[model samples]
Target chain A: GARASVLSGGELDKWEKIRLRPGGKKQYKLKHIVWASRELERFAVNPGLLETSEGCRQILGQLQPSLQTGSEELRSLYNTIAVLYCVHQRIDVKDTKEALDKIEEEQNKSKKKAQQAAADT
Target chain B: ARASVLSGGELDKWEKIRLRPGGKKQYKLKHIVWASRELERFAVNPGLLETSEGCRQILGQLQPSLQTGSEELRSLYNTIAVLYCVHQRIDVKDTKEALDKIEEEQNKSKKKAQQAAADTG
Candidate 1:
């Protein structure tokens, strides 16, 4: 997570902040977690629908049926159907992240090994 | 979405050319929307400070990027104001922040009446 933020700061400060303090959106190591009460208070609050990328696919998904079979339409539609299929049961963001992290780690390790093996071949 | 047109040159070639998303592409959304949402998530919007001056103000405050004179700064406030004008509902809050409210006086209901004792008596 290239994550950093709280209350307010500039853009590049984010990268700098994350680099400076892991899991934090500030520069220099803050002595107390209580600082975030001040730190993020000015910046963050309760977010509603527009606050996140939640319904974006519904918009992009609307463009599907008209699109050609392979031009992301078929693939996306398949996912759409599969999503209704999954959610028709129940799928969760936490579960998704958890599964992704597991696969991503395996893929990353294999990718490194795969690259070296290809080079040796 | 129902509208369709021929490429006038080739169909299958371009049709076969499907594009995968290169990145989050969140920039495609309105800057005000993006930044306001970020103001919730990260408590800051990198886009809001896309300007060189804004960047330096916050970014350089941390890293001290000396260069500023020649860089372009986006008027994130203008967009915010325009969006606010468009959407009466969107706001920093239902009311001004405590900082701005600091300039205000006590509520009428909370204030004591300007009563005068009978000095003549």
Candidate 2:
């Protein structure tokens, strides 16, 4: 038949921050990278995950911390996840706009500074 | 679970596709796997914008399958991601660590399921 929605409108709006958890004690085999990557890809395209607001929110919650506290590799994963999640949700609306505007302003200022330096030279 | 799980016919087809002398674009999963392998090679070695474009296109193909395909097809999705990260120059070691963490949890869940099965019997 039909699938039910994963999150209620109120639940979606709440933007809950779940705890960052730890890995388990099982021994890792290197080949599992392929298995994991395959699973990651499976997760990437499943509409059920993104169709429901909770899915995107869950991803956002997990990856958000990586952008701040994680290593370079972690940040890269976060960036990719954020881009994917952005398709489902408009993340960082105010902050993103301000940041973009600020970057443009800084670029304009730097352009003028460079031109002025050339004229002086 | 094993590399042997990939059938000979599939591998032969993939090999044939990769044999394209001109290095043309082939918009198929096998092609994506070949491309992903190329990207992973570059990630391990030292590496391109065009390849990135191709990977992105492959990602588009890969996305549809995640929601639509069986477990077999869904597994290859991570290869595209690995290629993307490799192109982006993220440290593979850290990326693997992140994936491994996820895998650890997944294994834990599987273990718990086994435990429940034991209890039920």
Candidate 3:
């Protein structure tokens, strides 16, 4: 399903919802718990088939829309993976905060300027 | 305090899962996968949050140093914060709003960068 979907543009849309399901016993009993454990194993021990770093980045890039629409549990997963991207990139939290602050500051300044122009009119 | 509630066994689950000491570079590649799995585990199992103290305990472990923490640590902090908020029935609107603002800034920067590259080319 993964390979076939990738042949078309549909795969890009599916990537955000694609989670690895468990194989047998854990599939029935533990469900997501055991599946997550196995994911850890694959990530920690062997990653020969996993996405490249660029692919991972793409996943994060396309995930924001899904994050807005997912269920609480699914949203949690989206939020988790997004932050993990930052971790993988070694992003600094302080830097993130600083950037956010600057953006907010600029936004406020723009709003004030627009309001002043309205007053002049 | 959260300190008194978390059993040593529970703490060991993730705390001990860090990049192995003196491990090969290839081994570190799995870190994100492993970390994501643990985070997903927390997300799917709201039962872990049954004891509010336990929730705080986990958050404490995931806390990042705002000014100096590694990207990995900050990601953990973000992952757990999202989980905690969802479990506590906090509104996600604020979180999504903040994310949207951040993305706007990213998009603006990317557009400028692209225009600069085009001019140079």
Q: Rank the candidates by TM-score, best first.
A: 2, 3, 1
The model with the greater lDDT, 1 or 2, is: 2
State the lDDT of candidate 2 residue by residue for B1-121, as single tens digits: 1132124443333333322225553224454445445535435211221345554555555555454444334334454444444444433333233233333444466446644643553
Off by over 4 Å in 1: A1-28, A31-33, A40-121, B1-4, B15-121
Off by over 4 Å in 3: A1-53, A94-121, B1-121
Interface RMSD of 1: 29.3
Per-candidate TM-scores read: 0.15, 0.23, 0.22
lDDT at position B118, candidate 2: 39
True contacts kept of each: 0.00, 0.00, 0.00
**What DockQ do the predictions score, one after another?**
0.01, 0.01, 0.02
| Shift of residue B94 alpha carbon in model 2, Å | 7.3
- lDDT tens string, model 2, A1-121? 1222433454334222211112323322222223333434554634445444356456556555334345544543443333334323443322222322333344446654664464354
True-structure lDDT of candidate 3 = 0.39
- lDDT by candidate, in order shown: 0.29, 0.40, 0.39
What would the per-residue lDDT of candidate 1 be over residues B62-91, giving only the tens digit for each residue?
Answer: 222212211112223323322232222222
Instruction: Provide the fnat value for model 2, as a fraction from 0 to 1.
Output: 0.00
Best by TM-score: 2
Docking class of 2: incorrect
